[PDB]
Amino acid sequence: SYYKGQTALHIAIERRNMTLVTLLVENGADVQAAANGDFFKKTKGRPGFYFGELPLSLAACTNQLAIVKFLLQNSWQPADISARDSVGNTVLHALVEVADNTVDNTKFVTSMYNEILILGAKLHPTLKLEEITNRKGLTPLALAASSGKIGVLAYILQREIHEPECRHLSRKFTEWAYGPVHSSLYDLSCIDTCEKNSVLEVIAYSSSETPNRHDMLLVEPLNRLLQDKWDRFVKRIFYFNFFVYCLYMIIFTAAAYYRPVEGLPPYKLKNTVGDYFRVTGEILSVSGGVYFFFRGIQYFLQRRPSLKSLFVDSYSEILFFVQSLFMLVSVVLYFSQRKEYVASMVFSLAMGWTNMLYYTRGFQQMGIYAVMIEKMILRDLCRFMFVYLVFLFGFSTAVVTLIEDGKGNSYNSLYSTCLELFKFTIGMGDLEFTENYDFKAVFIILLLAYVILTYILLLNMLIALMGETVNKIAQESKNIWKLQRAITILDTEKSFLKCMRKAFRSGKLLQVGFTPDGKDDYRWCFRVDEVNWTTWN
Amino acid sequence: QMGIYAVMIEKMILRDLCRFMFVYLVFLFGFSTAVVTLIEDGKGNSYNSLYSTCLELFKFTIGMGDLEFTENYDFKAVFIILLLAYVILTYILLLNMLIALMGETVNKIAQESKNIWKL
Amino acid sequence: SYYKGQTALHIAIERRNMTLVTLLVENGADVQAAANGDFFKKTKGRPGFYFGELPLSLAACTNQLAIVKFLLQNSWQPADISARDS
Ligand SMILES: CC(=O)Nc1nc2c(Oc3cc(-c4ccc(C(F)(F)F)cc4)ncn3)cccc2s1
Ligand code: NA
């Protein structure tokens, strides 16, 4: 319980009391404090600390090297390192759990992590502590990746260690070096393709809430690994797909332009050469439609998107799906004897053409443009649209009330006046479009006020804000594009899951170090050469 | 003073204008083919040709276009919706995009333009 | 060749070994190492160093004032400065 669950040790250690623990364990102190206190539970709503059920966890989350050394090297009761807590976190899991993203916390967390690992190595050198799982199912790496901790991930993937006595547990196995040049082999064991949660699979298919989802792909091996995959086997496939889609749109446009016009919908087939080509075109178009619909359904049913990330983490997918939906509705109408299918087909064709921009992500300098237009169709344009709509509606209803038409005559309808003011907005309007009014002064004053407030004031305001936003978000757009490219590389490699997988495996099977057991360390390493002129050691 | 101007116009005829031209061309072609499909001309009459409609949309772009240039269509709602969507996406969104990017590029490359002129 | 053309001096100096060269040239050390090793060739694709065929070049490209002074002011075999490479 809260204070019936807190053993002497928890609150004991809490106040940095070495002497007290000395005594308490000299006589004997239990090291299995099942503190589930609402204060000390995982519950985030409760203001407290999830240092960990076990007391070693409490010593660790706090900057106490002495106690973390002592509790484990104390003559007896060296609390079992593989101590699954309520949620399952081992000591390292808790250490990752507490870590924040501030620099000082980076120092603290990484520094401790290393030392605890080496102590565990010495203690019982058969337990692979970094693979122990948690309730949800996640290794320490998986957690650092999902929750989002730049520092911890950086350390683990660049975890270079020394003191050969036991150095198997490292990442950056250095190789031949000759002057200012030096090779280097990374590990890439649980990064690319294996387990149930790879690092490069939880950094991309992750919600937008995770902090710096788009900044963790610059660590060290991830970046070059993705680019090596791209330059080798995910370049030709993407271009061929682009070609196929561009051909499909052309066939659809050809089928649409030559639509027969004579009679109500279901149209019989002639026996001319052209009429067969038309039917073929129609069949291909509907096939494309069904394909896209099923793709959308699968996407939505497997990677469940939330209501907020619906339009923040999936924009291309939604548009693909909606285009497919319009196509299918057109088809269902066309067979029901209704000539309203032209509208659905037209909308489908327009959106299909505008959807080519999904392929700009293969080229560096246009993906940025596409992402920028995305951001400012969700950031800057909506607000301006709303305010301008209020202005237009107000002035249009005013003028329509003023107009008389008791005699360019049917200008009473609100629609006509609204259209005239919009025409004012697009630089074609007329300042004397009607004369039926009864007071010229009021009409001119309203028109001039509208022109001042919308044409000259709001539009230049929008230009100013767009300039400011651009100068703010150039870099953010770049990063978003990088993440988008990573998404597509993963998707393309997966899509051939059934076709082939062997060739789709980066790295090379190297063997550099050895294990304390006395065996080899067969690891899939990947070279990254470097040159330095100041280290010189 | 003027060599810098010439070099700047070169840089932005090889950097900024090409991309905008491509994207705008995609938009124009898509909406023009959509509208041309919608049009009927089963009765300002020979508006079936793709060329005439493309020219009309470009006229929209240069601030002279007309929002009721033809009446042969069969559904007014669809025609107006397409025209308004085009106007929102090209006239008000992309052009001010290009203004913003041109300003940013100028602020970035004043010095580069000077150096290129010296060379 | 790569390691057959690599003379004792090249790898010798490489590790900042004064004493060693002292001895090696005290008895005598050739200063005409024709190291054309793919690693040590002008080839940029090969990750290595083009410090230069002769070993004085190796001493020079690396921050070794001592050896560049020595190899030329050593009692004998002051490697011909005008030593055209490959
Ligand atoms: C797979 C995919 O689309 N990727 C991307 N598309 C775009 C983009 O294109 C659009 C087009 C439309 C649209 C809406 C309605 C209509 C109609 F009038 F027909 F109803 C037509 C078009 N809305 C939003 N975006 C603009 C900017 C960035 C990107 S990224
Ligand atoms: Na104008």
DSSP A65-93: HHHHHHHHHSSS----SS---SS---HHH
Assigned token pair, A410: 């049917």
Q: Give the SS3 label for residue A211.
A: coil
Residues in chain A: 537
Q: Give the SS3 label for residue A431.
A: coil
The amino acid at A52: G
Question: Do A183 and A177 touch, CB atoms closer than 8 A?
Answer: yes
Assigned token pair, C55: 């070993």
Give the number of beta-carbon pairs within 8 Å between A and C: 14
Residue B91 to residue A426, Cβ atoms within 8 A: yes
Nearest to B34 by CA among A285, A284, A348: A348
Question: Which residues lie closer than 8 Å to A8 by C-beta, 6 or more apart?
Answer: A24, A29
CA A19 to chain centre: 49
How many angstroms is it from A307 CA to the middle of ligand 1? Answer: 20
Please report which ligand is nearest the Cα atom of B34. Answer: 1
Q: Which residues of chain B does A474 touch, with a Cβ-Cβ cutoff of 8 Å?
A: 104
Give dist(CA A366, CA A356) in Å, integer.
Answer: 12
Q: Which residues of chain B does A242 touch, with a Cβ-Cβ cutoff of 8 Å?
A: none
Give dist(CA C6, CA C39) in Å, integer.
Answer: 11
Give dist(CA A171, CA A153) in Å, integer.
Answer: 12
Q: How far is B37 from chain A (nearest CA, A)?
A: 5
Query: What is chain C's alpha carbon radius of gyration, rounded to the nearest angstrom?
Result: 12
Give dist(CA C24, CA C18) in Å, integer.
Answer: 10
Q: How far is B26 from chain A (nearest CA, A)?
A: 7
Q: Which residues of chain B does A455 touch, with a Cβ-Cβ cutoff of 8 Å?
A: none
A179 in the Ramachandran plot: left (φ > 0), alpha (ψ -120 to 50) or beta?
Answer: left
Question: Do A481 and A361 touch, CB atoms closer than 8 A?
Answer: yes
Residue A350 to residue B34, Cβ atoms within 8 A: yes
Question: Do A199 and A226 touch, CB atoms closer than 8 A?
Answer: no
Question: Do A381 and A389 touch, CB atoms closer than 8 A?
Answer: no
Give dist(CA A456, CA B6) in Å, integer.
Answer: 31
Nearest to C50 by CA among C10, C83, C22, C7: C10
Q: What are phi and psi of A477, to 5 degrees?
A: -60, -45
Give dist(CA C15, CA B47) in Å, integer.
Answer: 82
Assigned token pair, B107: 């602020």
Assigned token pair, A286: 């509907």
Assigned token pair, A131: 């693979």
Q: Give the SS3 label for residue A176.
A: strand
Give dist(CA C14, CA C59) in Å, integer.
Answer: 8
Residue A428 to residue B66, Cβ atoms within 8 A: yes
Give dist(CA A210, CA A204) in Å, integer.
Answer: 11
Strand partners, A181: A178, A531
- Residue B29: closest CA among chain A residues belongs to which residue? A353
Question: Do A14 and A51 touch, CB atoms closer than 8 A?
Answer: no
Assigned token pair, A82: 């593989």
Token look-up 């907005």 returns A425
Question: Which residues lie closer than 8 Å to B81 by C-beta, 6 or more apart?
Answer: none
Contacts of C51-54 spanning 24+ positions with Cβ under 8 A = C51/A179, C52/C85, C53/C83, C53/C85, C53/C86, C54/C79, C54/C83, C54/C85
B23 lines ligand 1 (CB under 6 A): no
User: What is the H or E stretch that residue A60 is in?
Assistant: helix A55-61
Pocket perturbation via mutation, ligand 1, pick of A245, A246, A319 by most ligand atoms within 8 A of CB: A319
Which of the 8 DSSP states describes residue A218?
Answer: G
Burial class (CB in 10 A: 0-12, 13-18, 19+), A26: exposed
Compute CA distances A289 → A242, A257, A324, A340, whole Å: 17, 18, 5, 19
C50 in A contact zone (CB under 8 Å): no
Nearest to A161 by CA among A511, A513, A532: A513
Task: Please state the atom number of ligand 1 nearest to the C-alpha of residue A347.
Answer: 19
Give dist(CA A203, CA A213) in Å, integer.
Answer: 6
Token look-up 């639509």 returns A259
Q: What are phi and psi of A337, to 5 degrees?
A: 60, 60
Contacts of A193-202 spanning 24+ positions with Cβ under 8 A = A193/A501, A193/A505, A195/A139, A195/A142, A196/A137, A197/A137, A197/A138, A197/A139, A197/A142, A197/A146, A199/A141, A199/A142, A199/A145, A199/A153, A199/A157, A200/A225, A200/A226, A200/A486, A200/A490, A201/A490, A202/A142, A202/A145, A202/A146
Number of Cβ within a 10 Å radius of residue B80? 15
Give dist(CA A240, CA A27) in Å, integer.
Answer: 74
- Starting at the edge strand that comes first in sequence, how are the strands of the sheet with A181-185 ordered? A173-178, A181-185, A530-531
Q: Which residues of A364-400 are buried (b: 16+ CB within 10 A; e: fewer)?
A: eebbbbbbbbebbeeebbeebeeebeebbeebbebbb
Sequence-ordered alpha helix ranges (H) in A379-439 = 381-402, 414-425
How many angstroms is it from C78 CA to the middle of ligand 1? Answer: 75
Give dist(CA C53, CA C59) in Å, integer.
Answer: 11
Q: Which residues of chain A does B29 touch, with a Cβ-Cβ cutoff of 8 Å?
A: 353
Residue A343 to residue B34, Cβ atoms within 8 A: no
Sequence-ordered alpha helix ranges (H) in A99-149 = 103-123, 140-143
CA angle, A254 then A258 then A263, to 5°: 145
Give dist(CA A80, CA B73) in Å, integer.
Answer: 80
Q: What was the experiment behind these coordinates?
A: cryo-EM
User: What is the H or E stretch that residue A175 is in?
Assistant: strand A173-178
